[PDB]
Amino acid sequence: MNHIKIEKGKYVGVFPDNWKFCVGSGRIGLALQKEYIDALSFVKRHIDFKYLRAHGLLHDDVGIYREDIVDGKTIPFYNFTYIDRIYDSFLEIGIRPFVEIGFMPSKLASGDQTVFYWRGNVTPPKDYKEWEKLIKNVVKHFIDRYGEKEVTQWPFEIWNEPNLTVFWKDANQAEYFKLYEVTVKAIKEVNENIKVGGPAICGGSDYWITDFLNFCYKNNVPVDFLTRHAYTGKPPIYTPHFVYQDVHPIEYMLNEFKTVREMVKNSPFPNLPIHITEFNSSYHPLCPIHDTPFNAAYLARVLSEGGDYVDSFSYWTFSDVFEEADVPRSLFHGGFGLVAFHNIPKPVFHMFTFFNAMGEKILYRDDHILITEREDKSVALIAWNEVMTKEENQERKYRIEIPVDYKEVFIKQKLIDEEYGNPWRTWIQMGRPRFPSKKQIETLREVATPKVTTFRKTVENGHITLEFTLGKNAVTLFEISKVIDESHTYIGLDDSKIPGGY
Amino acid sequence: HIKIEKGKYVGVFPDNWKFCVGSGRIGLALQKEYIDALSFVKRHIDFKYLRAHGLLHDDVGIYREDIVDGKTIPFYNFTYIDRIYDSFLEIGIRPFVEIGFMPSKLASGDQTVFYWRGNVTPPKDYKEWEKLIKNVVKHFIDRYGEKEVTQWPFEIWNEPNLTVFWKDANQAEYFKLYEVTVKAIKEVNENIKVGGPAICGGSDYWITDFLNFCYKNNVPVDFLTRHAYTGKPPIYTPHFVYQDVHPIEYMLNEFKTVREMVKNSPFPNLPIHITEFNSSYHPLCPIHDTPFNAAYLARVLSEGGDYVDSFSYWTFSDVFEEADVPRSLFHGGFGLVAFHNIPKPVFHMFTFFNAMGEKILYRDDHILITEREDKSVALIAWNEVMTKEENQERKYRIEIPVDYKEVFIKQKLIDEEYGNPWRTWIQMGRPRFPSKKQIETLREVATPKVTTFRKTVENGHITLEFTLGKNAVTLFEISKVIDESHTYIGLDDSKIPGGY
């Protein structure tokens, strides 16, 4: 089935690089961890993410805000020891922070409500002039250490998911806007070329956008971009060890992108860049779907088309280095990361690297395949087949007619499915060891690769036809390119003369 | 002042000084900075063991609890500690396992210690704590094997004689905790050497109390542990802790009376492990950054090995959090190494002791001369100076017999002028959060002054004259030359432009 004839030198739209603009992370204090940095370098040797997005810049483990007690007065102290190391580490690797202002330092808090295992305080500041004092010092300290030309390339989003009460006392919307205003004017006081935005809402309360954008237009409050999150997980069941969840079809998320894009088109700021600062299928740090070939195939379409509606959409997260639900208890555990501990890539990691092959000129695209032309001649395509139900329809066949100007064609294929690059399975086979040995870790590394296959096709009537079939939860990548045979420059080349039947 | 000797020895310089080093909480071992530092140290000082608090702290998260139906069953999460002891072994160093503190879920009370809120109470249910220790030990053998883990010493708790580290300082209760813990470990593998009680100075009755308690009934003990500082009662400050200090002879004699106590105790050959030692005992005391502390502490490396099997400098680096997060590059943290792998003077003092052979030619309060198996000579001299109103310079004239005709001398000097990044940091403005180019300047100067000399040898001996400045340490290495110039035919430096 699925027949596709690509017409010689004809294009529909363009493939942008928005898909690699930013990733997500465990809280910024975890960037101190060797494992964190080892994983971040590994990712960055394979995907050129430009920005890194993480909670907890002002948590008390990074220890920025503290108080000194002179006489009877208390005085602010701004400790940059940890944040200097962390942001130094990023820039050395080549990734800037997408800065997320939050949460609230314990000694500025108004209440005792805290989210997560590491108890980030989510009450507003008990003194907004103290709050403004802290933001200002942080911002100019950044300018001093790193230079204005660089910090002006860092975006700042104000808080995280204020539409939820577990992320902002009473989900209070009047208060969030006051928090946003105090913060962004502090920032723009220090340098008004620094780009700010928000309101970083979860899905479900999209009216917050309209209220938020109206609030800014009304009261002359800067906003330079919009943010929101987007998961597809249906109500979960819990477990001391797991959170289990079903997910809407991937269409559901893409629909949200288009929806919020049109929401800002009817804003007073019809060109707000949109940054989807968090996206995944399931939204829990302990839900095993993140480990699965399914999740690669299910998210694949987001990379293929999400850039049509939003300027960025960052996958949460780049690594299982994470702590919102206590220290992971097993190598595979449901964590959000593209990479499990020991720099073991999950299916979804490889799916990301597949999109490195796409040129900008799109030859063809539908719900389950993208076909691009590179600037150099070449054609490259990615196809996916996510199968949600054990019922459903398990396989997907393609024949693709591809016109080529050359007589001799080289084809490379990379494939991941339940059989190839799925170390979760090999792990289950191992006995689901919670704390495996070096030798076990290394066999998992051996199998967490794509299957790579190469073909020579000497082509008929000026066109190649690719025939392949995707099994369940597979993603694949083909690169097609011109061969310049050099076998004639080998005088006396005869493979028949080599023992082995050749 | 004036020293001479001939072919004869006075003692043996053991490698005890390299035995173990202190560290921040093992939780901190996950930090890239920590591992970057431990690698840099271990590139220069072959330390064998590492001692740290916090093995059961909840940052590293070993002890957790799950609720099935109604009950609570334990859960032991090894993710972090596996990563940590993995990196230790990869670096080439093993842990002095210090059992502590108490996991919050197992704790009987509310009292904590440090910025990082380690619980200091006993277990609500000692049978549960027996479960915890044995499971952790078994996992260690499952992961690393018997032959390895049995090379790991186990120390129980830390400074129980103080209330801060063990509520009420209940010596009776601590004895109980020690008993349950020790034969748990031993039930898993009895060849695991265990010990205690890791108290600090000023309560040495605990020693033979503890020591006799273990002779009296059951309880096996394979070594003794104690800490050794010299800080006088301290002034406090929201940024600093300032302490004066007894002379170094204080703790060096504290070592000796502790050896005596065990020479007279039920275990006359009990090994002794000073698991912490420094001058001042606070993480925010600038003394640790100074040339003084290097010269003040040299003598512990010279003689302490004659009384104790080990004495671990608390700590190898400034990666520390007991007094919250350091607020300035130099802040008086304990570490041999400051952030960015910038060596403090004390570090260079440690690397000087690599040069010593085992055969001591001469030794006193302020020098140590040795011969190395290739029959070459080297010495370390120090000059600590506690006061402005003191003798400051300290002078040396040494005559050395040498069999050979041509000699080569290399000297490594550190004092207030050389190898002293603290001082350059003051010149720069005491920058709390230094730029990169400030860090690279600190590294350029945070190295000993190195100077070489060549001399012909007359009447089978040489003479070394040199003056230590205030708070100085220096190293001399004396070596045979085999001149090869005769084999350079046509050689003549005088034909080189440059007045040569």
Q: How far apart are CA A335 and CA A317, in angstroms?
A: 8
How far is the first Cα of chain B from the last one, in angstroms, to the nearest whole number?
Answer: 37
Q: In what order do the strands lie in the sheet with B359-364?
A: B11-12, B359-364, B367-372, B376-383, B472-480, B406-414, B449-456
DSSP A308: G
Decide if A73 touches B, using CB distance below 8 A. Answer: no
Give strand pairing partners of B156.
B99
Measure the CA–CA gap between A421 and A444, rounded to whole angstroms: 9
CA distance A159 to A142: 19
CB crowding B88-107: b at 16 or more within 10 Å, else e: beebebbbbbbbbbbbebbb
Phi first, then psi, for residue B377 (nearest 5°) are -120, 145
CA distance B433 to B441: 14
B369 shares its domain with B295: no
Contacts for B420 with CB less than 8 Å, ≥ 6 apart: B291, B345, B414, B445, B446
CB contact under 8 A, A81 and B327: yes
Q: Tell me which long-range contacts A260-265 makes (C-beta under 8 A, separation of at least 24).
A: A260/A206, A260/A209, A260/A226, A260/A228, A260/A309, A260/A310, A261/A309, A261/A310, A263/A206, A263/A209, A263/A210, A264/A209, A264/A213, A264/A226
What is the DSSP track for B83-104? HHHHHHHHHT-EEEEEE--B-G
Query: What three-state secondary structure class fits B298?
Result: helix
Contact A63 B325 (CB under 8 A): yes
B268 lies in the same domain as B371: no
The CA distance from B370 to B167, in Å, is: 47
Q: Do B32 and A89 touch (CB under 8 A)?
A: yes
Cis peptide before A103 (omega within 30 of 0): yes
Give the span between the Cα atoms of B177 and B123, in whole angstroms.
9
From the CB of residue A437, how many other CB atoms can be counted at a distance below 10 Å? 14
CB A241 within 8 A of CB B73: no
DSSP single-letter state for residue A118: T
A179 three-class SS = helix
- Cβ-in-10-Å burial (0-12, 13-18, 19+) of B304 comes to buried
Selected residues 337-356 of chain A with any CB under 8 Å from a CB in chain B: 341
The three-point CA angle A95-B321-A110 to 5° equals: 80
Q: What contacts 24+ positions apart, CB below 8 Å, involve B160-169?
A: B160/B197, B160/B198, B160/B199, B160/B206, B161/B197, B161/B199, B161/B200, B161/B202, B161/B203, B161/B206, B162/B199, B162/B200, B164/B113, B164/B120, B165/B113, B165/B120, B166/B120, B167/B109, B167/B111, B167/B120, B167/B121, B167/B122
Print the domain residue range for B134: 14-357
Q: Which of A202, A208, A198, A263 is nearest to A231 (CA)?
A: A202
Closest CA to B106 of B140, B69, B56, B59: B56
Distance CA A423, CA A420 (A): 8
Distance from C-alpha of B195 to C-alpha of B98, rounded to nearest angstrom: 10
Q: Which residues contact B308 (CB under 8 A, 6 or more apart)?
A: B16, B255, B258, B259, B272, B273, B274
Helix, strand, coil shares of chain A, percent, nearest 5, are: 35, 25, 40
Answer yes or no: do B388 and B416 share one domain. Answer: yes
* B106 in Cβ contact with B72 (< 8 Å): no
Q: Which residues, including other chains, have CB under 8 Å from residue A437's CB and lie 6 or more apart? A: B143
Contact between B433 and A68 using a beta-carbon 8 Å cutoff: no
Q: How far apart are CA B30 and CA B52, in angstroms?
A: 13
- Is B444 labeled as catalytic in the residue annotation? no
CB-based contact (8 Å) between B433 and chain A? Answer: yes
Whether chain A has a CB inside 8 Å of the CB on B78: the answer is: yes
Q: Are A331 and A434 in contact (CB under 8 A)?
A: yes
Evaluated on CA atoms B276, B277, B281, B282, the torsion sign reads: negative
Who contacts B321 (Cβ-Cβ below 8 Å, separation ≥6)?
Answer: B24, B25, B28, B114, B115, B116
For residue B223, the cross-strand partners are B195
User: Strands B94-99 and B49-52: what pairing?
Assistant: parallel
Indicate yes or no: CB of A434 within 8 angstroms of CB of B78: yes
| Residues of A noted as catalytic | 161
Three-state DSSP state, A190: helix
> And the tokens for A359?
């040129």
Task: Decide which of A336, A359, A382 is a domain's last residue.
Answer: A359
Q: Are residues B345 and B463 in the same domain?
A: no
Cα separation, A60 vs A55, whole angstroms: 12
Q: Which residues of B touch A329 (CB under 8 A)?
A: 64, 75, 77, 79
CA angle A358, A364, A366 (to 5 degrees): 100
CA–CA dist A291, A422 (Å, integer): 9
Domains held by chain A: number: 2
Helix B126-144 vs helix B79-91: crossing angle, to nearest 10: 50
Pick the residue of A435, A440, A441 with the most B CBs within 10 A to test the interface with B by mutation.
A435
Sign of the CA dihedral with A187 first, then A191, A194, and A197 last = positive
Angle at A188 between CA A182 and CA A190, to 5 degrees: 105
Say yes or no: B35 contacts chain A, CB-CB below 8 A. yes
Strands B20-22 vs B49-52: parallel, antiparallel or unpaired: parallel
Domain boundary among B357, B391, B410: B357
**Which amino acid, one-letter code, is at B359?**
K
Q: What is the Cα–Cα distance from B343 to B446, expressed in whole angstroms?
A: 6
Is A68 an 8 Å CB contact of chain B? yes
Whole-angstrom distance, CA of residue B166 vs CA of residue B174: 8
**Amino acid found at B435:** S
d(CA B275, CA B155): 9
d(CA A475, CA A350): 9
Domain co-membership, A321 together with A387: no
**3-state SS, residue B293:** helix
Tell me the one-letter amino acid at A47.
Answer: I
Q: Which amino acid is at B332?
A: G
Backbone angles phi, psi at B253, to 5 degrees: -80, -30
- Going from the C-alpha of B85 to that of each of B31, B49, B66, B101, B143, the distances in angstroms are 13, 12, 26, 18, 10
Residue tagged 């040396």 (tokens): B396
Strands (E), A64-211: 65-70, 73-78, 96-101, 114-115, 120-121, 156-158, 196-201
Cis peptide before B230 (omega within 30 of 0): no
DSSP conformation class of A496: G
Total residue length of chain B: 500
For chain A, state the CA radius of gyration.
25
> How many whole angstroms separate alpha carbon A413 and alpha carbon A467?
12
Report chain B residues whose CB lies below 8 A from the CB of A82: 325
DSSP state string for B418-442? SS-HHHHHHHHT--SS--HHHHHHH
Contact A164, A116 (CB under 8 A): no
Cα–Cα distance measured from residue B335 to residue B350, given in angstroms and rounded to the nearest whole number:
12
**Cα-Cα-Cα-Cα dihedral sign, residues A442, A444, A447, A450:** negative
At position B363, the amino acid (one-letter code) is R
CB B376 within 8 A of CB B469: no
- All residues of chain B having their beta carbon less than 8 Å from the beta carbon of residue A141 are 433
Could B432 and A326 be called an inter-chain contact, meaning their C-beta atoms sit closer than 8 Å?
no
Tokens standing for residue A408: 């001799």
- Do A291 and A280 have their domain in common? yes
- Tell me the two tokens of residue B239: 């940024």
Report the 10 Å Cβ neighbour count for B441.
Answer: 17
| Pairing, β A65-70 against β A73-78 | antiparallel
CA distance linking residue A154 with residue A196, whole number of Å: 9
Of the candidates A359, A376, A405, which is a domain's last residue? A359
Residue A368 identity? H
Closest CA to A52 of A25, A13, A89, A80: A25
* Contact: B324, A435; criterion CB under 8 Å: no
Location of structure tokens 């020479």: B263
* Cβ pair A74, A68 in contact under 8 A: yes
Are B227 and B159 within 8 A, CB to CB? yes
Token pair, residue B219, equals 């309880």
**Is residue A107 less than 8 Å (CB to CB) from chain B?**
no
B325 within 8 A of A79, measured Cβ to Cβ: yes
DSSP character for B358? S
Listed in sequence order, the residues at least 6 apart from B462 whose beta carbon sits closer than 8 Å to its beta carbon are B399, B400, B402, B407, B455, B478
d(CA B123, CA B133): 12
A375 and A296: one domain? no
For residues A471 and A419, is the Cβ–Cβ distance under 8 A? yes
Contacts of A391 (CB under 8 A, 6+ apart): none
- Residue entry with tokens 């002794």: B272
A179 & A45 share domain: yes
Residues near B489 by beta carbon (within 8 Å), at least 6 away in sequence: none
Q: What is the C-alpha radius of gyration for chain B, rounded to an integer number of angstroms?
A: 25
Q: How far apart are CA B201 and CA B181, in angstroms?
A: 24
- Under 8 Å CB pairs connecting chains A and B tally to 69
Let me know whether A350 and A371 are in one domain.
no
Gaps in chain A (C–N > 2.5 Å) come after which residues? Answer: none
Omega within 30 of 0 (cis) for the link into B315? yes
The Cα–Cα gap between B63 and B72 comes to: 12
Q: Do both A209 and A346 map to the same domain? A: yes
**Strand (E) or helix (H) holding B197:** strand B194-199
Beta strand extents in B210-326 (DSSP E only): 223-228, 235-236, 241-242, 272-277, 310-313
CA distance A223 to B432: 34
SS3 B235: strand
Q: Note whether B350 and B399 are same-domain residues.
A: no
Q: Is the dihedral of CA A60, A61, A62, A63 positive or negative?
A: positive
> Are residues A24 and A170 part of one domain?
yes
Q: Which residues contact A58 (CB under 8 A, 6 or more apart)?
A: A64, A65, A101, A102, A103, A104, A105, A134, A138
Q: State which residue of chain A sits closest to B61, comparing Cα positions.
A: A327
